Amino acid sequence: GLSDGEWQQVLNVWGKVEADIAGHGQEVLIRLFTGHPETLEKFDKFKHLKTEAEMKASEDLKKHGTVVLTALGGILKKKGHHEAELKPLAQSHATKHKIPIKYLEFISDAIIHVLHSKHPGDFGADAQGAMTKALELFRNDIAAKYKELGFQ
Ligand code: HEM
């Protein structure tokens, strides 16, 4: 649960992402894959990537970063009223991709890391607080659907 002022911060931060969605999406995925190499094994289409240089050169990885962040941005713009948008993603990630909730924690922290890396000094303490709460809400509502499905 976020206040109106917290949502305003979230959507202000998101404007930084929307100026370069592919560059942010690429870096989020690279941070996820290099920090937590077990996550790469869930992607049949990226498991061939052995080095970060190959990851950086991969246009398909940048494409997938765009898909991921476009979906997250659509959810965030709902300011918590995201049941219809979140349900299919929860279902696909539990039943088809088999993504443990832990990996959603990993990517949440990676988003925070990338924002500080690309906007040093321009991602303030209030903005970090609001973004973190928004990603926690997203993860918590996914977790509820995972529990319904019995997925661990
Ligand atoms: C911010 C969180 C994330 C969002 C919004 C997101 C969004 C999406 C979307 C929109 C798709 C394509 C449609 C679908 O299959 O449902 C996708 C595919 C996928 N997601 Fe996620 N995702 C997230 C986190 C993750 C994480 C943490 C992993 C694994 C570590 C992951 C693994 C996958 C995989 C394996 C695919 C299929 C890729 C393919 O082969 O084309 N997702 N995701």
PDB file of C-alpha atoms and ligand atoms in Angstrom:
ATOM      1  CA  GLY A   1       0.000   0.000   0.000  1.00  0.00           C
ATOM      2  CA  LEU A   2       1.455   3.278  -1.222  1.00  0.00           C
ATOM      3  CA  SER A   3       0.294   6.832  -0.626  1.00  0.00           C
ATOM      4  CA  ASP A   4      -0.447   9.208  -3.475  1.00  0.00           C
ATOM      5  CA  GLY A   5       2.883  10.947  -2.882  1.00  0.00           C
ATOM      6  CA  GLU A   6       4.747   7.645  -3.004  1.00  0.00           C
ATOM      7  CA  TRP A   7       3.118   6.695  -6.302  1.00  0.00           C
ATOM      8  CA  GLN A   8       4.099  10.119  -7.638  1.00  0.00           C
ATOM      9  CA  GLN A   9       7.717   9.341  -6.776  1.00  0.00           C
ATOM     10  CA  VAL A  10       7.485   5.929  -8.433  1.00  0.00           C
ATOM     11  CA  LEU A  11       6.138   7.353 -11.649  1.00  0.00           C
ATOM     12  CA  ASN A  12       8.708  10.145 -11.610  1.00  0.00           C
ATOM     13  CA  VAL A  13      11.505   7.551 -11.336  1.00  0.00           C
ATOM     14  CA  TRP A  14       9.859   5.532 -14.096  1.00  0.00           C
ATOM     15  CA  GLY A  15      10.218   8.495 -16.446  1.00  0.00           C
ATOM     16  CA  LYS A  16      13.976   7.957 -16.242  1.00  0.00           C
ATOM     17  CA  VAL A  17      13.479   4.353 -17.355  1.00  0.00           C
ATOM     18  CA  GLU A  18      11.117   5.275 -20.210  1.00  0.00           C
ATOM     19  CA  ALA A  19      13.714   7.602 -21.740  1.00  0.00           C
ATOM     20  CA  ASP A  20      15.864   4.541 -22.497  1.00  0.00           C
ATOM     21  CA  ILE A  21      13.822   1.397 -21.862  1.00  0.00           C
ATOM     22  CA  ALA A  22      16.112  -0.920 -23.800  1.00  0.00           C
ATOM     23  CA  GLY A  23      19.285   0.315 -22.095  1.00  0.00           C
ATOM     24  CA  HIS A  24      17.756   0.004 -18.630  1.00  0.00           C
ATOM     25  CA  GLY A  25      16.262  -3.392 -19.464  1.00  0.00           C
ATOM     26  CA  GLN A  26      19.574  -4.679 -20.781  1.00  0.00           C
ATOM     27  CA  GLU A  27      21.422  -3.595 -17.657  1.00  0.00           C
ATOM     28  CA  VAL A  28      18.796  -5.028 -15.302  1.00  0.00           C
ATOM     29  CA  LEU A  29      19.081  -8.433 -16.966  1.00  0.00           C
ATOM     30  CA  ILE A  30      22.880  -8.329 -17.022  1.00  0.00           C
ATOM     31  CA  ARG A  31      22.931  -7.470 -13.312  1.00  0.00           C
ATOM     32  CA  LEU A  32      20.539 -10.362 -12.638  1.00  0.00           C
ATOM     33  CA  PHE A  33      22.452 -12.911 -14.731  1.00  0.00           C
ATOM     34  CA  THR A  34      25.951 -12.008 -13.548  1.00  0.00           C
ATOM     35  CA  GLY A  35      24.996 -11.624  -9.895  1.00  0.00           C
ATOM     36  CA  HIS A  36      22.851 -14.777  -9.790  1.00  0.00           C
ATOM     37  CA  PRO A  37      24.029 -17.130 -12.562  1.00  0.00           C
ATOM     38  CA  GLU A  38      21.413 -19.746 -11.680  1.00  0.00           C
ATOM     39  CA  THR A  39      18.831 -17.327 -13.127  1.00  0.00           C
ATOM     40  CA  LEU A  40      20.383 -17.666 -16.590  1.00  0.00           C
ATOM     41  CA  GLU A  41      19.506 -21.376 -16.558  1.00  0.00           C
ATOM     42  CA  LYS A  42      15.792 -20.536 -16.681  1.00  0.00           C
ATOM     43  CA  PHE A  43      16.240 -18.952 -20.147  1.00  0.00           C
ATOM     44  CA  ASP A  44      16.752 -21.517 -22.854  1.00  0.00           C
ATOM     45  CA  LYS A  45      17.410 -18.624 -25.239  1.00  0.00           C
ATOM     46  CA  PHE A  46      20.153 -17.034 -23.105  1.00  0.00           C
ATOM     47  CA  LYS A  47      21.914 -20.039 -21.539  1.00  0.00           C
ATOM     48  CA  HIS A  48      24.432 -19.965 -24.411  1.00  0.00           C
ATOM     49  CA  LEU A  49      25.725 -16.643 -23.101  1.00  0.00           C
ATOM     50  CA  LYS A  50      28.937 -17.379 -21.255  1.00  0.00           C
ATOM     51  CA  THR A  51      30.502 -13.931 -20.807  1.00  0.00           C
ATOM     52  CA  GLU A  52      29.119 -10.531 -19.978  1.00  0.00           C
ATOM     53  CA  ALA A  53      30.545  -9.248 -23.280  1.00  0.00           C
ATOM     54  CA  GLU A  54      28.309 -11.734 -25.104  1.00  0.00           C
ATOM     55  CA  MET A  55      25.415 -10.571 -22.927  1.00  0.00           C
ATOM     56  CA  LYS A  56      26.124  -6.914 -23.772  1.00  0.00           C
ATOM     57  CA  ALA A  57      26.356  -7.710 -27.488  1.00  0.00           C
ATOM     58  CA  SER A  58      23.107  -9.704 -27.555  1.00  0.00           C
ATOM     59  CA  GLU A  59      20.341  -7.812 -29.294  1.00  0.00           C
ATOM     60  CA  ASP A  60      17.821 -10.444 -28.241  1.00  0.00           C
ATOM     61  CA  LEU A  61      18.710  -9.839 -24.588  1.00  0.00           C
ATOM     62  CA  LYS A  62      18.032  -6.134 -25.056  1.00  0.00           C
ATOM     63  CA  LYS A  63      14.753  -7.061 -26.743  1.00  0.00           C
ATOM     64  CA  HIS A  64      13.724  -9.176 -23.778  1.00  0.00           C
ATOM     65  CA  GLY A  65      14.692  -6.369 -21.415  1.00  0.00           C
ATOM     66  CA  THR A  66      12.236  -4.163 -23.291  1.00  0.00           C
ATOM     67  CA  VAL A  67       9.477  -6.773 -22.924  1.00  0.00           C
ATOM     68  CA  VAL A  68      10.102  -7.132 -19.176  1.00  0.00           C
ATOM     69  CA  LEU A  69      10.270  -3.444 -18.363  1.00  0.00           C
ATOM     70  CA  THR A  70       7.299  -2.579 -20.597  1.00  0.00           C
ATOM     71  CA  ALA A  71       5.216  -5.079 -18.635  1.00  0.00           C
ATOM     72  CA  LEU A  72       6.434  -3.760 -15.280  1.00  0.00           C
ATOM     73  CA  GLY A  73       5.777  -0.166 -16.312  1.00  0.00           C
ATOM     74  CA  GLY A  74       2.233  -1.043 -17.281  1.00  0.00           C
ATOM     75  CA  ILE A  75       1.707  -2.582 -13.837  1.00  0.00           C
ATOM     76  CA  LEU A  76       3.253   0.368 -11.973  1.00  0.00           C
ATOM     77  CA  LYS A  77       1.058   2.853 -13.836  1.00  0.00           C
ATOM     78  CA  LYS A  78      -1.973   1.135 -12.301  1.00  0.00           C
ATOM     79  CA  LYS A  79      -0.910   2.370  -8.830  1.00  0.00           C
ATOM     80  CA  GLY A  80      -1.762  -0.945  -7.209  1.00  0.00           C
ATOM     81  CA  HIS A  81      -4.957  -1.698  -9.156  1.00  0.00           C
ATOM     82  CA  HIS A  82      -3.160  -4.324 -11.208  1.00  0.00           C
ATOM     83  CA  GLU A  83      -5.060  -7.597 -10.672  1.00  0.00           C
ATOM     84  CA  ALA A  84      -5.831  -8.086 -14.380  1.00  0.00           C
ATOM     85  CA  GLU A  85      -2.273  -7.273 -15.476  1.00  0.00           C
ATOM     86  CA  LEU A  86      -0.571  -9.293 -12.743  1.00  0.00           C
ATOM     87  CA  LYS A  87      -2.610 -12.524 -12.893  1.00  0.00           C
ATOM     88  CA  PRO A  88      -1.303 -13.751 -16.309  1.00  0.00           C
ATOM     89  CA  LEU A  89       2.295 -12.989 -15.337  1.00  0.00           C
ATOM     90  CA  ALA A  90       1.943 -14.814 -12.020  1.00  0.00           C
ATOM     91  CA  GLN A  91       0.410 -17.755 -13.833  1.00  0.00           C
ATOM     92  CA  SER A  92       3.006 -17.943 -16.597  1.00  0.00           C
ATOM     93  CA  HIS A  93       5.899 -17.542 -14.180  1.00  0.00           C
ATOM     94  CA  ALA A  94       4.654 -20.240 -11.808  1.00  0.00           C
ATOM     95  CA  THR A  95       3.343 -22.791 -14.302  1.00  0.00           C
ATOM     96  CA  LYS A  96       5.377 -22.396 -17.488  1.00  0.00           C
ATOM     97  CA  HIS A  97       8.664 -20.703 -16.597  1.00  0.00           C
ATOM     98  CA  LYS A  98       8.867 -22.080 -13.037  1.00  0.00           C
ATOM     99  CA  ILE A  99      10.445 -18.963 -11.556  1.00  0.00           C
ATOM    100  CA  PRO A 100      10.774 -19.066  -7.751  1.00  0.00           C
ATOM    101  CA  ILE A 101       9.722 -15.938  -5.881  1.00  0.00           C
ATOM    102  CA  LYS A 102      13.337 -15.586  -4.744  1.00  0.00           C
ATOM    103  CA  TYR A 103      14.279 -14.640  -8.314  1.00  0.00           C
ATOM    104  CA  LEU A 104      11.695 -11.858  -8.271  1.00  0.00           C
ATOM    105  CA  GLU A 105      13.426 -10.547  -5.150  1.00  0.00           C
ATOM    106  CA  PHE A 106      16.731 -10.700  -7.045  1.00  0.00           C
ATOM    107  CA  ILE A 107      15.384  -8.690  -9.992  1.00  0.00           C
ATOM    108  CA  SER A 108      13.777  -6.156  -7.668  1.00  0.00           C
ATOM    109  CA  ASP A 109      17.103  -5.448  -6.017  1.00  0.00           C
ATOM    110  CA  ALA A 110      18.756  -5.360  -9.455  1.00  0.00           C
ATOM    111  CA  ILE A 111      16.387  -2.597 -10.572  1.00  0.00           C
ATOM    112  CA  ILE A 112      17.426  -0.500  -7.553  1.00  0.00           C
ATOM    113  CA  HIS A 113      21.088  -1.162  -8.305  1.00  0.00           C
ATOM    114  CA  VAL A 114      20.767  -0.147 -11.962  1.00  0.00           C
ATOM    115  CA  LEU A 115      18.916   3.056 -11.105  1.00  0.00           C
ATOM    116  CA  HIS A 116      21.760   4.166  -8.841  1.00  0.00           C
ATOM    117  CA  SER A 117      24.351   3.107 -11.424  1.00  0.00           C
ATOM    118  CA  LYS A 118      22.778   5.018 -14.326  1.00  0.00           C
ATOM    119  CA  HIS A 119      21.567   8.021 -12.298  1.00  0.00           C
ATOM    120  CA  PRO A 120      24.115   8.486  -9.489  1.00  0.00           C
ATOM    121  CA  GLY A 121      23.087  11.312  -7.210  1.00  0.00           C
ATOM    122  CA  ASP A 122      19.730  11.578  -8.980  1.00  0.00           C
ATOM    123  CA  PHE A 123      17.911   8.672  -7.269  1.00  0.00           C
ATOM    124  CA  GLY A 124      17.156  10.127  -3.864  1.00  0.00           C
ATOM    125  CA  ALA A 125      16.314   8.450  -0.599  1.00  0.00           C
ATOM    126  CA  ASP A 126      12.600   9.187  -0.943  1.00  0.00           C
ATOM    127  CA  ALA A 127      12.536   7.855  -4.507  1.00  0.00           C
ATOM    128  CA  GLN A 128      14.314   4.667  -3.450  1.00  0.00           C
ATOM    129  CA  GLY A 129      11.843   4.184  -0.610  1.00  0.00           C
ATOM    130  CA  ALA A 130       8.852   4.530  -2.918  1.00  0.00           C
ATOM    131  CA  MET A 131      10.285   2.334  -5.677  1.00  0.00           C
ATOM    132  CA  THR A 132      11.180  -0.372  -3.183  1.00  0.00           C
ATOM    133  CA  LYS A 133       7.655  -0.371  -1.755  1.00  0.00           C
ATOM    134  CA  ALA A 134       6.175  -0.618  -5.253  1.00  0.00           C
ATOM    135  CA  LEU A 135       8.363  -3.612  -6.127  1.00  0.00           C
ATOM    136  CA  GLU A 136       7.488  -5.215  -2.808  1.00  0.00           C
ATOM    137  CA  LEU A 137       3.778  -4.841  -3.541  1.00  0.00           C
ATOM    138  CA  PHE A 138       4.271  -6.382  -6.988  1.00  0.00           C
ATOM    139  CA  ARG A 139       6.205  -9.310  -5.493  1.00  0.00           C
ATOM    140  CA  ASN A 140       3.702  -9.784  -2.663  1.00  0.00           C
ATOM    141  CA  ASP A 141       0.724  -9.966  -4.995  1.00  0.00           C
ATOM    142  CA  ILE A 142       2.605 -12.488  -7.158  1.00  0.00           C
ATOM    143  CA  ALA A 143       3.410 -14.471  -3.994  1.00  0.00           C
ATOM    144  CA  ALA A 144      -0.291 -14.692  -3.161  1.00  0.00           C
ATOM    145  CA  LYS A 145      -1.000 -16.228  -6.571  1.00  0.00           C
ATOM    146  CA  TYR A 146       1.963 -18.583  -6.179  1.00  0.00           C
ATOM    147  CA  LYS A 147       0.480 -19.795  -2.868  1.00  0.00           C
ATOM    148  CA  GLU A 148      -2.905 -20.390  -4.478  1.00  0.00           C
ATOM    149  CA  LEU A 149      -1.147 -22.573  -7.081  1.00  0.00           C
ATOM    150  CA  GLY A 150       1.033 -24.351  -4.530  1.00  0.00           C
ATOM    151  CA  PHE A 151       4.153 -23.300  -6.407  1.00  0.00           C
ATOM    152  CA  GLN A 152       7.486 -23.137  -4.644  1.00  0.00           C
TER     153      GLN A 152
HETATM  154  C1  HEM B   1       9.961  -7.471 -13.048  1.00  0.00           C
HETATM  155  C2  HEM B   1       9.725  -8.782 -13.111  1.00  0.00           C
HETATM  156  C3  HEM B   1       9.379  -9.463 -14.381  1.00  0.00           C
HETATM  157  C4  HEM B   1       8.475  -9.131 -15.371  1.00  0.00           C
HETATM  158  C5  HEM B   1       7.547  -7.927 -15.394  1.00  0.00           C
HETATM  159  C6  HEM B   1       8.512 -10.170 -16.331  1.00  0.00           C
HETATM  160  C7  HEM B   1       7.760 -10.114 -17.522  1.00  0.00           C
HETATM  161  C8  HEM B   1       7.776 -11.100 -18.498  1.00  0.00           C
HETATM  162  C9  HEM B   1       7.018 -11.082 -19.699  1.00  0.00           C
HETATM  163  C10 HEM B   1       6.057  -9.983 -20.098  1.00  0.00           C
HETATM  164  C11 HEM B   1       7.314 -12.218 -20.363  1.00  0.00           C
HETATM  165  C12 HEM B   1       6.710 -12.688 -21.660  1.00  0.00           C
HETATM  166  C13 HEM B   1       5.267 -13.196 -21.492  1.00  0.00           C
HETATM  167  C14 HEM B   1       5.168 -14.326 -20.512  1.00  0.00           C
HETATM  168  O1  HEM B   1       5.729 -15.406 -20.811  1.00  0.00           O
HETATM  169  O2  HEM B   1       4.418 -14.217 -19.512  1.00  0.00           O
HETATM  170  C15 HEM B   1       8.369 -12.877 -19.650  1.00  0.00           C
HETATM  171  C16 HEM B   1       8.966 -14.062 -20.060  1.00  0.00           C
HETATM  172  C17 HEM B   1       9.849 -14.753 -19.255  1.00  0.00           C
HETATM  173  N1  HEM B   1      10.159 -14.476 -17.957  1.00  0.00           N
HETATM  174 FE1  HEM B   1       9.648 -12.949 -16.907  1.00  0.00          FE
HETATM  175  N2  HEM B   1       9.350 -11.134 -15.913  1.00  0.00           N
HETATM  176  C18 HEM B   1       9.911 -10.802 -14.737  1.00  0.00           C
HETATM  177  C19 HEM B   1      10.898 -11.475 -13.987  1.00  0.00           C
HETATM  178  C20 HEM B   1      11.513 -12.644 -14.391  1.00  0.00           C
HETATM  179  C21 HEM B   1      12.554 -13.328 -13.721  1.00  0.00           C
HETATM  180  C22 HEM B   1      13.167 -12.952 -12.383  1.00  0.00           C
HETATM  181  C23 HEM B   1      12.876 -14.427 -14.490  1.00  0.00           C
HETATM  182  C24 HEM B   1      13.866 -15.510 -14.264  1.00  0.00           C
HETATM  183  C25 HEM B   1      14.938 -15.426 -13.496  1.00  0.00           C
HETATM  184  C26 HEM B   1      11.977 -14.436 -15.597  1.00  0.00           C
HETATM  185  C27 HEM B   1      11.944 -15.429 -16.526  1.00  0.00           C
HETATM  186  C28 HEM B   1      11.149 -15.369 -17.657  1.00  0.00           C
HETATM  187  C29 HEM B   1      11.346 -16.348 -18.735  1.00  0.00           C
HETATM  188  C30 HEM B   1      12.146 -17.649 -18.667  1.00  0.00           C
HETATM  189  C31 HEM B   1      10.558 -15.949 -19.754  1.00  0.00           C
HETATM  190  C32 HEM B   1      10.403 -16.646 -21.093  1.00  0.00           C
HETATM  191  C33 HEM B   1      11.428 -16.090 -22.082  1.00  0.00           C
HETATM  192  C34 HEM B   1      11.302 -16.728 -23.444  1.00  0.00           C
HETATM  193  O3  HEM B   1      11.830 -17.841 -23.647  1.00  0.00           O
HETATM  194  O4  HEM B   1      10.944 -16.056 -24.420  1.00  0.00           O
HETATM  195  N3  HEM B   1      11.101 -13.382 -15.471  1.00  0.00           N
HETATM  196  N4  HEM B   1       8.552 -12.233 -18.437  1.00  0.00           N
END
